[PDB]
């Protein structure tokens, strides 16, 4: 039983979000939804999410899951807004509590900020099975880009997050806190051991769908024949040349909260905190 | 007695800073010095200021004034860092207290944030005379870009801030809070009534020095013959098309403090506050 998958490209952040629909029912999940954010003005907008809401409404779907593949450093999540409009259960990999506990310190939030994942309604363990309607699904731990990345298998497909790019772009950076180029190399090996026909759906592109086959032989960074020590050297060498993602500091502190904005002050206004000279 | 003026271009922010030196002594002032700031990482760096420090050290100058022409929305000021290394008296126009009182509310700082200009050691009134060594100087109120802009006359020259651009670029936006396209029009008229040979030194360029003469007849936005109501219409029409300056929210909250970073938290880290959905 194969999922009905609709991709949604966001040109500002190069993010693909997905609606993952059970063909035998109206149940669906939403993967990596984007809350649009203008960092110069601090304006959040709902254009990308409204595309998702309209699709769900057109096809009269019931949102069962709001899935995050990892903690996004390049965009803010629109999960909370979609959850208000469409319902559904907010979910992420269990190792999100490592990112919460680390960045609670880096953002200086105190214990008014819980670091155990309560903001998310489900934390997936490695290998955990679950369903989207009748669809059969499993969550695999695939860390390396971040400590907490998950790949979601759903029928014949896999939502790999930032664990791979399209074969001609290669792989993503691993210099996020807790990221590990060698952990990512072995996460990719796990992905390559899947059936070569598995539909692979990327989180970013700089062109959303490939296969395990295409990747295994044609990925410019981790084709077959690229050993662990070679890849690591190149990954860390490219990472050193990379400036920090523009939205990283706003994105983490929203996304580590499940996509809740920071609390309102007596002002009536909510504020992000931008650590100075910490990175 | 004419000032010895050295210009310093910052390509990241298109800012001209100046060293204004009294030829008959070693006294100088520093105008609009830049603290380099990477907004993605929250990294401040001291490259631009180190150029100023080296010049002061080469020519064995004594910093008497650290002048700001206005509250900068496009860069953070390096006044406090220069003040530590070189000394000197930090100064700005008296109407800085309007910007402090407004943005103390917009940034929700409470009364742990004084709104009377104590962070600056001198607040210039309109028409106030002062000296840089033997040089004769006067501060004119020239609002419009911001409520608090000042033009500094020093001998035969004038540091106009963002009150004008070079004649072929025209004028700057007036949509900052308290800014007023019509106030700016009449500030410019005041500048045009100066002697046509007055050396005019811009704060930005997108090429630092022109004359009142060149401006009066050749400014593409406010040449002679452009009336008050025409200019205002065009200024507000262009302003509406403009996205907010990238660094505006970090820059104001540092510069409204005289260039002090926000306080250290028990973390040991300092934080900017970015209002959400307020602009
Ligand atoms: Cl597209
Ligand atoms: Cl459920
Ligand atoms: Cl130059
Ligand atoms: Cl003095
Ligand atoms: Zn990512
Ligand atoms: Zn300005």
Place of tokens 């910007």: B99
Task: Kindly report the nearest CA distance between residue A118 and chain B, in angstroms.
Answer: 24
Q: What is the C-alpha separation between B276 and B270, in angstroms, rounded?
A: 19
CA angle A166, A172, A177 (to 5 degrees): 155
Note the helical H segments in B87-227. 96-107, 181-192, 212-218
Resolution (A): 2.1
Contact list, A245 vs chain B (CB under 8 Å): 40
- Using DSSP's 3-state secondary structure scheme, residue A151 falls into strand
- Taking the centre of ligand 1 as the mean of its atom positions, its distance from the CA of residue A203, in whole angstroms, is 13
Q: Are A84 and A267 in contact (CB under 8 A)?
A: no
The ligand minimizing its distance to the Cα of B124 is 4
Cα dist. B66→A76, A244, B4 in Å? 40, 33, 16
Q: CA A103: distance to chain centroid?
A: 17
* Residue in B19, B18, B5, B3 with CA at minimum distance from that of residue B135: B3
Residues of chain A with Cβ-Cβ distance to B277 below 8 Å are: 42-44, 269-270
Residues with their C more than 2.5 Å from the N of the next written residue in chain A, i.e. before a break, are 206
Q: What angle do CA A94, A100, A103 make, to 5 degrees?
A: 150
Contact B108 A42 (CB under 8 A): no
Query: Cα(A162) to centroid of ligand 5, in Å?
Result: 5
Three-state secondary-structure class, residue A185: helix
Which stretch of DSSP H or E encloses residue B19?
strand B15-21
| β partners of residue B157 | B154, B199
Alpha carbon distance A92, A258 (integer Å): 9
Q: Which residues of chain A are within 8 Å of residue B274 when distances are taken between CB atoms?
A: 39, 42, 250, 271-274
Cross-strand pairs, B92: B123
Distance (Å, whole) CA B32 – CA A159: 51
CB of B212 closer than 8 Å to CB of B198: yes
Taking Cα atoms as reference points, which of B29, B24, B25, B34 lies closest to residue B6?
B29
Coil, strand or helix: which one is B251?
helix
**How far is the centre of ligand 4, averaged over its atoms, from the C-alpha of B192 (Å)?**
29
Burial of B242 (0-12, 13-18, 19+ CB in 10 A): exposed
User: Residues B161-176, buried b or exposed e (16+ Cβ, 10 A)?
Assistant: bbbbbbbebbbbbbbb
Q: Which ligand is nearest to the CA of B87?
A: 4
CB atoms B271 and A269 under 8 Å: no
What count of residues does chain A have?
A: 279
Ligand that lies nearest to the alpha carbon of residue A132, given by its number in the listed order: 2
Method: X-ray
Closest residue by Cα to residue B23 from B70, B73, B59, B66 = B59
Binding-site positions of B for Zn(2+) read: 70, 145, 162
Q: What angle do CA B79, B82, B88 make, to 5 degrees?
A: 85
Give me the helices (H) in chain A, please.
Answer: 47-58, 79-86, 96-107, 181-192, 212-218, 228-240, 248-255
CA distances from B257 to A241, B118, B120 (A): 34, 9, 8
Q: Which residues contact A3 (CB under 8 A, 6 or more apart)?
A: A20, A21, A22, A23, A132, A135, A154, A155, A156, A157
Around Cβ A156, how many Cβ atoms within 10 Å?
Answer: 12
Instruction: Count how many Cα atoms sit within 13 Å of the Cα of residue B48 in the half-sphere of its side chain.
Output: 28
Asked whether the beta carbons of residue A44 and residue B276 sit closer than 8 angstroms, the reply is yes
For residues A275 and A103, what is the distance between their CA atoms, to the nearest angstrom?
Answer: 11
Residue A163 tokens, joined: 């664990």
3-state SS assignment for residue A276 = strand
**Which residues have a Cβ under 8 Å from the Cβ of B96 and sit 6 or more positions away?**
B71, B117, B120, B123, B148, B256
CA–centroid distance, A152 to ligand 5, in Å, is: 15
Using DSSP bridges, classify how beta strands B34-38 and B43-45 pair: parallel, antiparallel or unpaired.
antiparallel
Nearest to B275 among A42, A246, A278 (CB): A42
Cβ count near A231 (within 10 Å): 20
User: What is the distance in angstroms between the CA of the first residue and the CA of the last residue of chain B?
Assistant: 46
Of the ligands numbered here, which is closest to the C-alpha atom of A62?
A: 2
- B127/B140 Cα distance (integer angstroms): 5
Give the integer Cα–Cα distance in Å for A65 and A87.
9
CA distance B273 to chain A (A): 5
Residue-by-residue DSSP string for B89-122:
EEEEETTHHHHHHHHHHHHT-TTSS--SSTTSSE
Binding residues of B: 70, 145, 162
Query: Pick from A30, A6, A138: which is nearest to A87 by CA?
Result: A30
> Nearest chain A Cα to B273, which residue?
A273
Strand residue runs (E) in B125-182: 128-132, 135-141, 150-154, 157-161
Q: Rounded to the nearest 5 degrees, what angle is found at the Cα of A138, between the Cα atoms of A136 and A141? A: 170
Alpha-carbon span A251 to A68, nearest angstrom? 13
Q: Are A277 and B43 a contacting pair at CB < 8 A? A: yes
Is A275 in contact with B42 (Cβ distance < 8 A)?
yes
- Considering only CA atoms, which of B75, B83, B8 is closest in space to residue B37? B75
Task: Report the distance separating Cα B43 and Cα A96, nearest Å.
Answer: 26
Residue A237 neighbours by CB under 8 Å, 6+ apart: none
Residues in B whose CB is inside 8 Å of some CB of A read 38-44, 105-108, 243-250, 261-262, 265-267, 269-279
Discontinuities in chain B with C to N beyond 2.5 Å fall right after: 206
**Matching CATH number, A4-243, of 3.40.50.180, 3.30.360.10, 3.60.15.10, 3.40.50.720:** 3.60.15.10
Q: What is the phi/psi pair of residue B69, to 5°?
A: -75, -30
The total of other beta-carbon atoms located within 10 Å of residue B237's CB is 10
Q: Which of A36, A39, A40 to mutate to test the interface with B (most CBs of B within 10 A)?
A: A40
CA B120 vs CA A132, B66, B124, B258, B268: distances in Å: 62, 10, 10, 6, 25
CATH architecture for the domain at B4-249: 4-Layer Sandwich (3.60)
**Whether B105 and A43 lie within 8 Å, measured CB to CB:** no
3-state percent helix, strand, coil for chain A, nearest multiple of 5: 25, 30, 45
CA distance B107 to chain A (A): 8
Q: What is the DSSP string of B6-59?
A: EEEEETTTTEEEEEEE-TTSSEEEEESPEEEEETTTTEEE-HHHHHHHHHHHHT
Q: How far is CA A10 from CA A74, A251, B42, B216, in A?
A: 11, 15, 25, 47
Chain B residues within an 8 Å CB radius of A249:
40-42
Q: B108 vs A272: CB contact, 8 Å cut-off?
A: no
Q: How wide is the angle at C-alpha B74 spanned by C-alphas B71 and B79, nearest 5°?
A: 55
């Amino acid at each position: 039983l194969k999922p009905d998958i609709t991709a949604f490209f966001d040109p500002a952040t190069s993010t693909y979000s997905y609606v993952v629909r059970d063909p035998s029912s109206r149940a669906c999940a939403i993967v990596d939804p984007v809350l649009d954010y203008d960092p110069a003005a601090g304006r959040t907008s709902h254009a990308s999410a409204e595309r998702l809401i309209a699709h769900v409404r057109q096809h009269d779907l019931q949102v069962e899951w709001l899935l995050e593949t990892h903690v996004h450093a390049d965009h803010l999540s629109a999960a909370i807004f979609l959850q208000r409009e469409l319902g559904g259960c907010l979910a992420i990999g269990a190792r999100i509590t490592q990112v919460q506990a680390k960045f609670s310190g880096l953002f200086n939030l105190g214990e008014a900020f819980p670091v155990d994942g309560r903001q998310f309604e489900h934390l997936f363990e490695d290998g955990e099975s679950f369903r989207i309607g009748a669809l059969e699904c499993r969550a695999l731990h695939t860390p390396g880009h971040t400590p907490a990345c998950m790949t979601y298998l759903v029928g014949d497909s896999a939502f790999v997050g930032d664990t791979l790019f399209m074969p001609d772009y290669g792989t993503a950076r691993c210099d996020f806190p807790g990221g590990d180029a060698r952990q990512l190399y072995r996460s990719i090996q796990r992905l390559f051991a899947l059936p070569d026909a598995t539909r692979l759906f990327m989180c970013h592109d700089y062109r959303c769908e490939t296969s395990v086959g295409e990747q295994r032989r044609h990925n410019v960074h981790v084709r077959e024949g690229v050993d662990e020590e070679a890849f690591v050297a190149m990954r860390q060498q490219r990472d050193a040349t990379l400036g920090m993602p523009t939205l990283m500091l706003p994105a983490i502190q929203v996304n580590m909260r499940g996509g809740n904005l920071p609390p309102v002050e007596g002002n009536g206004v909510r504020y992000l905190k931008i650590p100075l000279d910490l990175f």
